[PDB]
Amino acid sequence: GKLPPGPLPLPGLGNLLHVDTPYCFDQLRRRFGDVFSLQLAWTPVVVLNGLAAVREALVTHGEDTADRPPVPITQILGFGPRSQGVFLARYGPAWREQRRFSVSTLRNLGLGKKSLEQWVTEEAACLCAAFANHSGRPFRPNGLLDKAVSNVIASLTCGRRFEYDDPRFLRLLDLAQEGLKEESGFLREVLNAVPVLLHIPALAGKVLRFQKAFLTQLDELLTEHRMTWDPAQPPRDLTEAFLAEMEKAKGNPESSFNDENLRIVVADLFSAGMVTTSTTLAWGLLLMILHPDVQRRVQQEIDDVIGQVRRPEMGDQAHMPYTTAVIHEVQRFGDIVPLGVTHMTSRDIEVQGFRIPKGTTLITNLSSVLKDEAVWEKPFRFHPEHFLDAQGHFVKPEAFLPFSAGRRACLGEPLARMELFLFFTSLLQHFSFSVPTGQPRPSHHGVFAFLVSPSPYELCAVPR
Numbered sequence: 001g002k003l004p005p006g007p008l009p010l011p012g013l014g015n016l017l018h019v020d021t022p023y024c025f026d027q028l029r030r031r032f033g034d035v036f037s038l039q040l041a042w043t044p045v046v047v048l049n050g051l052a053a054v055r056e057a058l059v060t061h062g063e064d065t066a067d068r069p070p071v072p073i074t075q076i077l078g079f080g081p082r083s084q085g086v087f088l089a090r091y092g093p094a095w096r097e098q099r100r101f102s103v104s105t106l107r108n109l110g111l112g113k114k115s116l117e118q119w120v121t122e123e124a125a126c127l128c129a130a131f132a133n134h135s136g137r138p139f140r141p142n143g144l145l146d147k148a149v150s151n152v153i154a155s156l157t158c159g160r161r162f163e164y165d166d167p168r169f170l171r172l173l174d175l176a177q178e179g180l181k182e183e184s185g186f187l188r189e190v191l192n193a194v195p196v197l198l199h200i201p202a203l204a205g206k207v208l209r210f211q212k213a214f215l216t217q218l219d220e221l222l223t224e225h226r227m228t229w230d231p232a233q234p235p236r237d238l239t240e241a242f243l244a245e246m247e248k249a250k251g252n253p254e255s256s257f258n259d260e261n262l263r264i265v266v267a268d269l270f271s272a273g274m275v276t277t278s279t280t281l282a283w284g285l286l287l288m289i290l291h292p293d294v295q296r297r298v299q300q301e302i303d304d305v306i307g308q309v310r311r312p313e314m315g316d317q318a319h320m321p322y323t324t325a326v327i328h329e330v331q332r333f334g335d336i337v338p339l340g341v342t343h344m345t346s347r348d349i350e351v352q353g354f355r356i357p358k359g360t361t362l363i364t365n366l367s368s369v370l371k372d373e374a375v376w377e378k379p380f381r382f383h384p385e386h387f388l389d390a391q392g393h394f395v396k397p398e399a400f401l402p403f404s405a406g407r408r409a410c411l412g413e414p415l416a417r418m419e420l421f422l423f424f425t426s427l428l429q430h431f432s433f434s435v436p437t438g439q440p441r442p443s444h445h446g447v448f449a450f451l452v453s454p455s456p457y458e459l460c461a462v463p464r
């Protein structure tokens with residue numbers, strides 16, 4: 001069939017100089033259509049735009065697009081056939097076993113005695129107190145959001161939290177944010193292309209220094225956890241559940257439940273739901289000071305449904321359509337993973353008539369879905385009524401895809417939904433946020449990366 005169109009491919013760089021990225025893709029979408037091609041050096045890339053193209057790839061051809069592009073340099077971090085974690089894992093048994101394990105263990109810890117909801121609610125309390133200490137004084141809330149969000153994951157993985165001034169905790173969070181920067185590095189591409197370049201010890205020790213440091217700090221914490229683990233009792237957290245599975249899997253070279261995969265799985269879970277959920281909440285609080293009237297309606301609904309003392313529960317959401325709409329609109333407008341996470345075709349597939357060869361790198365332009373002018377009333381405005389009808393009922397459009405879609409859709413979404421609702425309501429239940437008098441109106445345009453964060457800003461949190 002016909003291959004997707006695209007700008008003229010230069011000899012060596014191809015379309016590398018035709019892309020400086022979501023803004024640039026919008027122009028290409030308006031010039032070549034919703035499915036265009038790109039030649040990024042050695043890698044053949046097809047960009048998918050709009051709900052239909054994205055759905056057709058990830059749902060209709062879900063079996064064939066659930067794979068990841070190979071990342072050879074992950075060998076430095078100890079990746080192997082039965083140890084690929086979940087996030088970057090190739091489509092196959094190693095991915096599926098860990099995927100099913102994480103999803104089911106989240107659910108098991110989730111239901112019963114609401115361990116998840118309890119850990120979040122309790123961490124929300126700490127976040128409130130830490131906010132109270134920063135009162136009467138403008139302050140960036142990002143650091144506190146990272147910590148509270150990080151503690152929720154630590155609670156699920158290792159069954160503990162860390163104090164906000166814990167030295168090892170800070171180093172962990174610091175190493176994690178530096179590591180994220182290392183993923184968007186130019187040297188990553190060269191070494192992924194030619195794996196034998198890693199046989200140079202000079203280079204190998206430079207590639208993922210912050211990644212390796214992060215995994216080292218994590219190893220130390222895992223070792224402590226293995227000491228306190230009581231195998232005579234039902235697993236209290238995901239790491240214990242993993243360790244129990246490891247015992248049963250002794251003698252089985254096919255199991256992905258092993259030492260090498262434990263640190264990778266934990267690192268995937270710990271980080272993927274630390275910079276995403278926290279950035280979303282950082283967007284949330286920014287949008288609340290830019291739109292004080294929206295903030296007041298939320299706080300009003302909080303009082304009408306929950307009050308100003310009793311801690312919020314997930315059962316309250318069903319009776320809080322407006323707050324729910326606001327949170328959704330934060331994710332939509334926030335648009336924090338505009339190009340999602342790359343997929344790869346494991347077979348020859350067909351998208352929007354065009355042909356996609358096997359082994360093609362797929363980019364899901366999630367931004368083009370969340371900001372679709374054909375779907376949303378005013379997609380470039382912060383507008384909670386994107387999820388409300390005239391009667392005030394919450395409505396969720398098909399195009400709400402911040403967690404992507406299909407087999408590889410965010411496994412942490414249920415937890416994320418929980419963290420977002422409980423942290424947001426709890427903060428707005430006890431605080432009123434506003435721009436600091438004397439300071440310029442903070443921009444609503446984010447700083448582009450693999451993850452789009454709000455521009456740096458300060459705020460005032462006055463108690464209620």
Ligand code: HEM
Pocket residue numbers: 086087088099153268269272273274276277280336337340341342364402403404405407408409410411412413415416
């Ligand atoms: C606002 C919060 C979050 C957003 C917007 C978000 C978004 C995403 C996106 C776009 C993907 C890519 C899906 C794809 O490859 O097509 C993804 C995958 C993933 N997310 Fe999240 N995420 C969030 C929070 C979390 C949390 C809390 C966790 C874990 C506790 C988590 C863990 C993961 C993992 C492990 C994957 C890989 C799944 C797989 O490859 O099978 N994320 N997420």
Ligand SMILES: Cn1cc([C@H]2C[C@H]3CSC(N)=N[C@@]3(c3ccc(F)cc3F)CO2)cn1
Pocket residue numbers: 087088175176177178179180183210211214267268269271272273275276337341450451
């Ligand atoms: C959805 N989404 C998750 C992300 C996260 C996922 C994590 C874990 S797995 C990975 N490959 N990179 C991340 C990551 C990797 C190493 C590290 F030291 C810190 C990290 F945050 C960055 O992107 C960004 N968007």
Ligand SMILES: [Zn+2]
Pocket residue numbers: 154157158221222
């Ligand atoms: Zn831990």
Ligand SMILES: [Zn+2]
Pocket residue numbers: 158159225229236237239240
């Ligand atoms: Zn434990």
Ligand SMILES: [Zn+2]
Pocket residue numbers: 389391392393
């Ligand atoms: Zn209605």
Ligand SMILES: [Zn+2]
Pocket residue numbers: 308429430431463464
């Ligand atoms: Zn209060």
